[PDB]
Write a protein that binds this ligand. Structure first.
Ligand SMILES: *C(=O)[C@@H](NC(=O)c1c(-c2ccccc2)noc1C)[C@@H]1N[C@@H](C(=O)O)C(C)(C)S1
Length: 250
């Protein structure tokens, strides 16, 4: 299951990793760089997957929800508009995530984190800033490893979390991206950020694959590296995942 021959060149210049597991059997299908796989880091926008489960479970959104933009610039042009739960997921609209956390509230988020067994469960935010409610998952206190993300994703698709079944399937639906070359279906989510107080970038791309073979899988592509001042780490993590998945017979 060592796929280093293919994955190494794709992750050159970074500390990267890749994991692919069969969702039903938990069999490891492919791995690159287990040491990086075990290292906890900020989930960044991949935390939206957890927030989506919470929001649907708590019945504060549905698929017809329109998140209303406040007309002020949010940093990225794609963020400067109304959104749906689908486009929230697709474009990692951070202000929607923050609207959602403020609505659920800290203690209830902590309770969900405990139910999800999610990473270090540290939602305290930045030292001395009391900003955890709206920043904890963004290069801050909350950390989770690629291996932990695999098992979280596995729980989701197997309905082994104490949330509404619809909350799970609406969130999965809203992750759908495309089909791959052999028609396998890709459901995924990016996240990226700079490491606090450093120049390093971290990136993720993770999710589900549903094969016409019948098999379902969960995967995680993640990296950390000095890639300059343009945040491209999730672009790279995504690219790499798709390249690697298309080489496989799933
Ligand atoms: C989630 O990971 C979100 N990332 C950020 O908010 C982010 C940025 C940023 C860079 C460029 C433009 C806007 C924001 N800088 O630091 C952080 C923590 C969103 N998701 C990312 C993704 O890969 O999904 C981005 C870069 C698209 S923004």
């Amino acid at each position: 299951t060592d796929i280093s021959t293919v994955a190494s060149p794709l992750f050159e210049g970074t500390e990267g990793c890749f994991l692919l597991y069969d969702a039903s059997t938990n069999a490891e299908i492919a791995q690159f760089n287990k040491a990086k796989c075990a290292t906890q880091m900020a989930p960044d926008s991949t935390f939206d997957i957890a927030l989506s489960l919470m929001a649907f479970d708590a019945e504060i959104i549905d698929q017809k929800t329109i998140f209303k933009w406040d007309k002020t610039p949010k940093g990225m042009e794609i963020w400067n508009s109304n959104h749906t739960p689908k486009t929230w997921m697709q474009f990692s609209v951070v202000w929607v995530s923050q609207e959602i956390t403020q609505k659920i509230g800290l203690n209830k988020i902590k309770n969900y984190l405990k139910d999800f067994d999610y990473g270090n469960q540290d939602f305290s935010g930045d030292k001395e800033r009391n900003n955890g409610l709206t920043e904890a998952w963004l290069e801050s206190s909350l950390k989770i490893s690629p291996e932990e993300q695999i098992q979280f994703l596995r729980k989701i698709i197997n309905h082994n979390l104490p949330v509404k079944n619809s909350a799970i399937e609406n969130t999965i639906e809203n992750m759908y991206l495309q089909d791959l070359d052999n028609s396998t279906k890709l459901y995924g989510k990016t996240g990226a950020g700079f490491t606090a107080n450093r120049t390093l970038q971290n990136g993720w791309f993770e999710g589900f694959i549903i094969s016409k073979s019948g098999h379902k899988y969960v995967f995680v592509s993640a990296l950390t590296g000095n890639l300059g001042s343009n945040l491209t780490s999730s672009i790279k993590a995504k690219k790499n995942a798709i390249t690697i998945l298309n080489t496989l017979n799933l």
